[PDB]
């Protein structure tokens, strides 16, 4: 089975 | 090197109670030293920690899908994920290796590249157990997937006497007892 | 609680090193090497029984660096305080002569994540046989460092770890050698 990533936000600009 | 440095982490963190049973998440924004954002699946919502947070708390609250998805990633990423290395995570079983020798006076009990951490280490002085004067070293994680503790017996040991060291761990069906005789 | 799994990452500039990894329990299932851009399994056996895809992690480490320049800006460029480490040199078993064994030496409870370990084996650096972990996270977010020696215990050699970080003003030299 694969390993999921949790994506990262971009942030407030 | 002295010129200045600007660090950002960013952390999920998936914490088990009961299995899988209940789960929990942690979304942690590091600047710095300073932890200033986060989403806890307990809350529902980002919360910002610091000043420094309230833009971001702000903007990814104002995205549904975020929170939509974020919602629902006890189940898709932290269940998923814990069922993905289950036999060799939560299911590792390496037994310790015991033994027992003087180091002046203290008779110490030496259990090496065990896991997991969850230990039990008893003292025995003629088949009766010392409990005053123990102390430990606690459990010393190797970054290898092992683990050793050592337990002292402040004792200056009588001849004829028997120490016993009895340590019980998942790893094993009964406990492992080692023999020191004065 | 039972267990915790983390997917941790970070960016540092003007040094521009990211990282990405899974933590088990406070030991690292995997981490992804940015030069190579592939998995790098903590122990080999993982590989066996377990996947990763790792353009997954480098996009998030695009994202990490990104808000990092956000927030750099946002803080009036207000930098890290360097916090110097913790190192601590043990044995992975108690120590018999003639009988391998691996030398650790454990830095712990620093920031930034850069630091300098070397091996000194009668006080020259062996650069031969070394082993080192990624920089593990800390719950007061600061980093843990595992760098390991498998040697010979012997009456006849003593080993030093030399430690340097931008906290300390001189590097750390901590010893061990075998004892009676
Ligand atoms: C590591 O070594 C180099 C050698 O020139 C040095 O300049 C640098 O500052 C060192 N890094 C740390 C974190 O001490």
Redesign the interface.
Known sequence: ?13 | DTRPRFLWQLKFECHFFNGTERVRLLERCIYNQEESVRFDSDVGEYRAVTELGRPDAEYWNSQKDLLEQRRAAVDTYCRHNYGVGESFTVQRRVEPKVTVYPSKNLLVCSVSGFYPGSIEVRWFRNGQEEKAGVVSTGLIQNGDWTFQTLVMLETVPRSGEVYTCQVEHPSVTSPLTVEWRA | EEHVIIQAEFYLNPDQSGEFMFDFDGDEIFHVDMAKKETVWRLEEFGRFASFEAQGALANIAVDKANLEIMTKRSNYTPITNVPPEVTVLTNSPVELREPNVLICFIDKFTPPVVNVTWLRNGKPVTTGVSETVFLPREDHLFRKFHYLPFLPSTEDVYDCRVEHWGLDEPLLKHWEFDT
């Open positions: 089975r694969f390993y999921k990533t949790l994506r990262a936000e971009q942030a407030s600009q």
